[PDB]
RNA sequence: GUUAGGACCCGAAAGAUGGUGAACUACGCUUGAAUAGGGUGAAGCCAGGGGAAACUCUGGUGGAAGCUCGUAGCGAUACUGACGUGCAAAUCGUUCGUCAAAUUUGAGUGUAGGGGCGAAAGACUAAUCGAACCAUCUAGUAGCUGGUUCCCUCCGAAGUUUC
RNA sequence: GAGUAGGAGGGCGUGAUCGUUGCCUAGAAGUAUUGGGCGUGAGCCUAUAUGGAGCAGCGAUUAGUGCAGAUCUUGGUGGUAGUAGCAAAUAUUCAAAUGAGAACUUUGAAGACCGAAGUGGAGAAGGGUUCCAUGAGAACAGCAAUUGUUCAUGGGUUACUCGAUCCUAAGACAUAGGUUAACUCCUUGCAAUACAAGAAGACAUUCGUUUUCGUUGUCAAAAGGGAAUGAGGUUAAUAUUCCUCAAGCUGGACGUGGUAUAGAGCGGUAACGCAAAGAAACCCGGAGACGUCAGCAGGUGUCACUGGAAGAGUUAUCUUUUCUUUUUAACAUACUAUGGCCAUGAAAUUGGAUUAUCCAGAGAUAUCGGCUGUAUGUAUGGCAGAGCAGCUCAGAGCUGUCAGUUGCGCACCUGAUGACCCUUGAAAAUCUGGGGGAGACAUAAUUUCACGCCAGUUCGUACCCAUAACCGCAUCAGGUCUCCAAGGUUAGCAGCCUCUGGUCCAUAGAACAAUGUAGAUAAGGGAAGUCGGCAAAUUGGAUCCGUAACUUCGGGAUAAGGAUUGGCUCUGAGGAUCUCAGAACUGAAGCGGACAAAGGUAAUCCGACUGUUUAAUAAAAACAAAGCAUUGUGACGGCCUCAACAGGUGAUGACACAAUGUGAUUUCUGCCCAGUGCUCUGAAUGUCAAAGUGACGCAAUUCAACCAAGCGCGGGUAAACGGCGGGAGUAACUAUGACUCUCUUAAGGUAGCCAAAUGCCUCGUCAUCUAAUUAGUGACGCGCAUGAAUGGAUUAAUGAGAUUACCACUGUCCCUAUCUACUAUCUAGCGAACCCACAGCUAAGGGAACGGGCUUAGAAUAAUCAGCGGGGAAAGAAGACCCUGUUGAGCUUGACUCUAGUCUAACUUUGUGAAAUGGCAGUCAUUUUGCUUAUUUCGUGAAGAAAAGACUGGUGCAAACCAGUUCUAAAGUUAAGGUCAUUUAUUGACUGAUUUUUGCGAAAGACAUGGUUAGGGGGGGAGUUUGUCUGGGGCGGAAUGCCUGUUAAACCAUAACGCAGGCGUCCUAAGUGUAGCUCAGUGAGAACGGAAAUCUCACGUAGAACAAAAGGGUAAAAGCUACAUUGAUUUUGAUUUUCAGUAGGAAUACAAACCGCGAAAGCGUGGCCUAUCGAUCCUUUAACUUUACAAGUUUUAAGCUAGAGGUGUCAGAAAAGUUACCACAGGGAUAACUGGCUUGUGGCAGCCAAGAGUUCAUAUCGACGUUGCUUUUUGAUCCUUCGAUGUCGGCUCUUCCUAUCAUUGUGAAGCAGAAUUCACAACGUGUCGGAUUGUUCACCCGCUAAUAGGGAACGUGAGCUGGGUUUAGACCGUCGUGAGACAGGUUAGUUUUACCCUACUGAUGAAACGAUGUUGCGACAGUAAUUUAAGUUAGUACGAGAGGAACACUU
């Protein structure tokens, strides 16, 4: 009568607890100042540095407070070809330009687009990660609606008042290089919650995990556990619609559709 | 003499309640320490021959890798060696795996019992683990094993029936 | 006159209580008795001795009242036994001294060890006085002790500069807020799930006053950060602390000098410079502040060498010799230092530059150029006065401590670089700098200059840090984190040897047997040894040669292999202002001379690789992994955590996170969606709850209708769980095999691949390897049971991973020998433990079926010592196997019951406008659309919300729009300016910077969310169950409830998983009655008519029929036919069978009825008789002036009697698996081994004689039958062993059997010779070497006189071995949904104790008829030699020939 890995992920005195020793800021946007709604701000980079969870390189951005003498230092995601000193601009006003802050009701149609925001003043949400970016598909008239197409490949109607970075997330492509070794698996997900190696569970004994069979190593009853499953039950492929590689009867994608 | 109770006395593998442990050991984390001398020879760089250049061949230079021989360290293959009322509740001799990494290691700090923690052996969790340790309910129940303490005299069995 | 289990009657002995009678310092109780007595016996009385204060009888009362046991409790003691033993870590020896005593103490003299990876010098953790001195009886320091880590007594731990204290980290805890019955719990540095929480200044100097800026805590580092100290000297014990001398730091407070200014240093073109050169808010910096590795450069320390001086060692010989000292702290001043800057000038015939990179018109190179940064550098101060080394004097004194050189040497530090990351390598306190210039100030004000004055508190400072101060019950061969490191050899911090420093501590002496532990060496052969090359052996450095297949082109690779290596004397080449190569000579042809240091090759299987794993039996083929693939999730979310409030991932956002699977590359990825799952924006009404609704009722209720999820329906899905046959036919000897048809609700083994680590048969078949191969390899494949990410096929590198050859190699073997050390031995000293009913010689016998004890025989002499492994069915542990228990636990599910998260519906939290519609007499039901204030979510240093307006500019008709901040890693703060007063000052007031607004901002919004109910779902989780009998249990079967005939032996009764069978129904007639008839069958006879249809007669004891099995019963019937009727009915009770003489099932006889049939008697309470069946509680029904308990009427609800609904395990529980991860109580009531009975089966013999032997039964055999023997087969049984008799085989060794293989002497023959066969006396002696296999067996290759068969607990595990078998890891196949399982393969997996008694082998040995020698006798015990060959016989006898002997003699 065990406890799964699965289950043991969610204490949060536990094992699995991110190694946050390393981050540096969180990355987001500027506060939402009245100067980004009704103005520009501009502000520069004073560094791009990497944060040793991420993949897509941080913006380390001054910008001089509208209320007071200090100078804010805020941290943004790196667009593709932004550089160290760079003049970013932020708000409403603030043209298009690689790296700089607007609304995307304000950006084109086609426009590549990185960390946009889901509700109106996120400093971000979606298309954070290192190389990726948004496509923007369409505007309403009223200007209140955007169609946005996520990495994910979803379409997602965003009020359009929303912050967007025009250009991609820096630092693309990393996950197309192979990792030949274990070592370096194990070097990465050390600044991460800990999710290696990963112990199949059939090797495990039935007290350990659903899977682990017995005296030959097989599953032995369907992996395919539906949603509703409890706790300790949810262990295969869960609420799966399809299960097989399609090979062969691929013309069916494109006369199904 | 029936029966209830500690119930002639001593005896479980178990249960439940409420506590205590991560000084061993398992996995994080912060912050320190540590690993003779060799072999090999990648990019990158120089020159010579050929070429108009691209590039080629020969010779250097350079110093890569979860590469290699091999100490210390960390380990544990074999003799099925010694010892087996030990030096020792795991040691000793030879031998052997590995030896700049998924390396070794100190402290501090996070995880506690149907819970942790696990490169998964049902492994480890203070000589305790296929459910720790401490006290209590608890003299737990025992159709089962063992014991059941002075004299003489007299009567004197059953191992079949039924449920 | 017996007696276990058991019961009764009397009695003995012990406390204490109420009585009664007494005894005791003139000696109570208790205790010892080879004193004297009493009881059958419990027990008693006395005597003597001891003892030194209480006792005793009798009658009752009461009881913690009697012990040999319980592996019983606690305590005390034996034998073993002066035994096992005191043997690791190389070592000690001599003289003196001290002492009662010295192998073990102290000095000296010798010999060795640790050998700067120490047995050295110091720390952290841990210890806590173990430190120092003096003293010392016992104990302890496993011998000893004069000695101590021990005992006693006293004494030791000084700090501004070391550390703690401060800082921050991983973290953690308050406060605040919230949760809990409560305890508890949740948040908080990016600081909050919080928030009216702060700090500073000045005057005041309290308050107060006043001003300024402001959201809010703390703890966690004796290795991280971290203000400043050094050298010398001193104590018995402390010292970067005390003393002496010399320094630095921070905080104070003034003094004296000096900088700067009427606003605030001076020099240089510039980098920049110089003792000093005004300041607040405010904002920004620098240092602190950082990874790993590789090479280069420099410095420190060390090491080496050179001249000088002092000392010491050697001096027969040689040595201008060999060793030693020859030092310089922090700190002060000045200079130099791997880099970077500034000029001037610009570079192409491009240059510069490092070992390496690398730089330049984005200005390189270069200038008698210049500036700057870092010392563990130089000089001087310190400082020689100290320290060191010498030499004098009797505490004082003198001399010298000097001047050079080099290093790829070594350790550390620094400097400039380079390489690396799907890694990128803290923070804060602290010191300091910049931008800014609000304030302050004339007798003034302010200022990082000198020199002087004052202070630095609290705690830790001893000592060990380990083969004796820690943890391992200890003075334990284990374990435990760091720093410093010398010479020689050398690649080397290796090994070996040394100097400094340390140490000889491990009880000792002597002998030198067996056996052992460790160390070596063996002629000839070379794995023949063995499950196996286990173990050992070989190999090994460096230089030169030479180097395959294979391959992922990296590799393989020291592949394989072949040579060389000393010494000495010369020669040449590489460099600054230590490497490399040649030649010659010389030796026992040796020379990596010690040390150090790979054995190869060819195949097969796994896993790709580094890595991981079962602390203490598994290191692997298991796990991991990179690659492959699949699932889920866009945040109103996924996965998980959570008692609650709530939380983590998340400082996150698809190049992300959460679930699985497969397992590098290469190649391949067949066909199945019927099932189980999962899924879907499919259809839809089949099914379905609470609430709400409708109808009946003054009502409770009941009845109806509607109704979410889920179910069911349909679609999708196999890199989801999983599946990939059975039958028939066709071609037709079958099989396997081809096609086809067919059945199950899918499909019907596609590519591939094997007798595979997955084929039973199996030692498959053929090749190959060998003399011989159940082994290896390659092939074939009617694959028991191969097959595709439940992955299939491949595969280089690779491995303490499985297997087979071969080469080298060898003591594994033939075959065993010898040598060393430590033991065993003996001695001085010291000194346990296991175990122990009582004990210990056997033979048989019987016996609980292997006695030591008993019967009968053999027989039997003290006490000892060293050995040994036969016996004590020896020790170990209340069997881990097996069964039993109404005993468990771990795990599983399609077991029973339940259960957290979760899905769905209702009511509630719940507001308000409007519209549309229906009903009601403003309200209500329904639909639609809003609003926002409840509610929810997310933000924000709750600034620019919503609505209006304005300056400038531009576009511009108003309107509206655009801009007043887009080349440029800068600056933007205590403000200007206008208007109006005071006051003439950054004074006062407005404005500069619009207005209004009882929402900081945004997103949802009565939705969500929360609360309670209702229906789904739920091995994630809890609880529990998972019959019995049984020739062990299981699988099977029911001898589990019933009936008949047998076993059963003439009343009844009687066992077995004993025989042969039958029951859980069937029947409105097959019950009941009346009447009539006589059936089965046989002979003879009648159209179609036939063996058989109907019709006749005669005869028919019953041979037919009677639902069902058997047995019995029946002839005007019980059978056949016809008709009538419900007696298959109402009351009770009794009787018989089984029997507890309970129940239940059956049936019988009565008494009351009400009937049916018959004229009537009569017969009917079910089936001719013997089987056909079911309690308590509950429900339902029938019948009844039973009750609802103040009184009533209802409705409803309870009752009494009796049926039906049922328990088949049938006297009647609601119940699935697995465990090899396992557990407990027991069981020899019961399996697995030996032994016992049996002997079918196995083996071995006979009797008869049909036959075979051409002729002839019995030379040699023996059919059909038949009598036996044996216990090396197997079976059967269950007697002994379950608080254990160690369960296969081989090795080793001994003995016995004879059913004789050989050898000896013979008989017989279908015996010529030779060979062979049968038999007798007979084991006396012998019965061998290898392939494959764990093997017993089997089969082969061989030699041989022969290569006999057996026994001894299937001889022989405190004799080995451990291959097989049978725990725990793991692979495949088959089975199971699963956990798991195999009576199937694979692979890794512990082998303890002897010192006792006996036994045997050896060795001493007391004592009688006097002692003691020498020489003998000999009882008895044991015995030992057995074969073969050659010559000769002899080419002989015999024989047609082929062929072919023997005795004697000799070796
Ligand atoms: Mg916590
Ligand atoms: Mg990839
Ligand atoms: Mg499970
Ligand atoms: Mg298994
Ligand atoms: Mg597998
Ligand atoms: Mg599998
Ligand atoms: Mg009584
Ligand atoms: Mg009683
Ligand atoms: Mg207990
Ligand atoms: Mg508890
Ligand atoms: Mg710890
Ligand atoms: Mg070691
Ligand atoms: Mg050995
Ligand atoms: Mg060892
Ligand atoms: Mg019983
Ligand atoms: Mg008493
Ligand atoms: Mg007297
Ligand atoms: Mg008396
Ligand atoms: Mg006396
Ligand atoms: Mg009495
Ligand atoms: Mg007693
Ligand atoms: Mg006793
Ligand atoms: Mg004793
Ligand atoms: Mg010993
Ligand atoms: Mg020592
Ligand atoms: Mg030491
Ligand atoms: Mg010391
Ligand atoms: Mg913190
Ligand atoms: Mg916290
Ligand atoms: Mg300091
Ligand atoms: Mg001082
Ligand atoms: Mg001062
Ligand atoms: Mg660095
Ligand atoms: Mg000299
Ligand atoms: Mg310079
Ligand atoms: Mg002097
Ligand atoms: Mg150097
Ligand atoms: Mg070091
Ligand atoms: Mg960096
Ligand atoms: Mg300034
Ligand atoms: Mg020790
Ligand atoms: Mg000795
Ligand atoms: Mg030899
Ligand atoms: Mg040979
Ligand atoms: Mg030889
Ligand atoms: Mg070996
Ligand atoms: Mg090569
Ligand atoms: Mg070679
Ligand atoms: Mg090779
Ligand atoms: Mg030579
Ligand atoms: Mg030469
Ligand atoms: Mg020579
Ligand atoms: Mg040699
Ligand atoms: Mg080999
Ligand atoms: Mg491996
Ligand atoms: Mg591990
Ligand atoms: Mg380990
Ligand atoms: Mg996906
Ligand atoms: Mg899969
Ligand atoms: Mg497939
Ligand atoms: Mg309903
Ligand atoms: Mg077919
Ligand atoms: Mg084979
Ligand atoms: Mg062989
Ligand atoms: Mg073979
Ligand atoms: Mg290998
Ligand atoms: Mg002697
Ligand atoms: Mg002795
Ligand atoms: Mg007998
Ligand atoms: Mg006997
Ligand atoms: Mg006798
Ligand atoms: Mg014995
Ligand atoms: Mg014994
Ligand atoms: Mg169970
Ligand atoms: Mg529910
Ligand atoms: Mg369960
Ligand atoms: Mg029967
Ligand atoms: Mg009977
Ligand atoms: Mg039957
Ligand atoms: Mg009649
Ligand atoms: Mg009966
Ligand atoms: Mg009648
Ligand atoms: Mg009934
Ligand atoms: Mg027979
Ligand atoms: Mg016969
Ligand atoms: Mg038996
Ligand atoms: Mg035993
Ligand atoms: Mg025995
Ligand atoms: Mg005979
Ligand atoms: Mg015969
Ligand atoms: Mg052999
Ligand atoms: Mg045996
Ligand atoms: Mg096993
Ligand atoms: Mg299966
Ligand atoms: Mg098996
Ligand atoms: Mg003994
Ligand atoms: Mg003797
Ligand atoms: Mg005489
Ligand atoms: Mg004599
Ligand atoms: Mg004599
Ligand atoms: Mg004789
Ligand atoms: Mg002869």
Same mark, same amino acid.
């Given at each position: ?17 991110? #190694? ?63 550089? &160290? ?12 330009? $690689? ?12 426009? $590549? ?55 991609? $997330? ?38 350990? #995990?659903? #899977?682990?069979?017995?005296? #030959? ?8 556990? &539906? ?7 949810? $262990?295969?492929?869960? @609420? @799966? ?17």
């Amino acid at each position: 009568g065990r406890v799964i890995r699965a289950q043991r992920k969610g204490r949060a005195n536990g094992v699995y607890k991110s #190694h946050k020793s390393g981050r540096i800021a969180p990355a987001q946007y500027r506060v939402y100042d009245f100067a980004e709604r009704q103005g520009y701000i501009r502000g520069c980079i004073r560094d791009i540095v990497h944060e040793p969870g991420r993949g897509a390189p941080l913006a380390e951005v001054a910008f001089r407070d509208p209320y007071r003498y200090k100078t804010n230092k805020e941290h943004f995601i790196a667009a593709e070809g932004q550089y &160290s000193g760079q003049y970013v601009y932020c708000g409403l006003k603030a043209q298009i330009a $690689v790296g700089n802050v607007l609304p995307i009701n304000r950006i084109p149609e086609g426009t $590549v687009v990185c960390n946009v925001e889901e509700k109106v003043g996120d400093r971000g949400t979606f298309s954070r990660a290192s190389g990726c970016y948004a496509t923007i598909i369409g505007h309403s008239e009223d200007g209140d609606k955007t169609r946005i197409r996520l990495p994910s490949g979803a379409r997602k109607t965003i009020p359009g008042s929303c912050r967007a970075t025009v250009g991609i $997330v820096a630092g693309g492509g990393r996950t197309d290089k192979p990792i030949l070794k274990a070592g370096n698996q194990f070097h990465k997900y050390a600044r991460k919650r800990k999710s290696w190696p990963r112990v199949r569970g059939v090797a495990m004994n039935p007290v350990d #995990h659903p #899977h682990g069979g017995g005296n #030959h190593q097989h599953i032995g009853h369907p992996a395919t556990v &539906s949603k509703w499953a409890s706790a300790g039950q949810k $262990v295969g492929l869960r @609420a @799966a619609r399809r299960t097989g590689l399609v090979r062969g009867g691929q013309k069916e994608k494109m006369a199904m559709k």
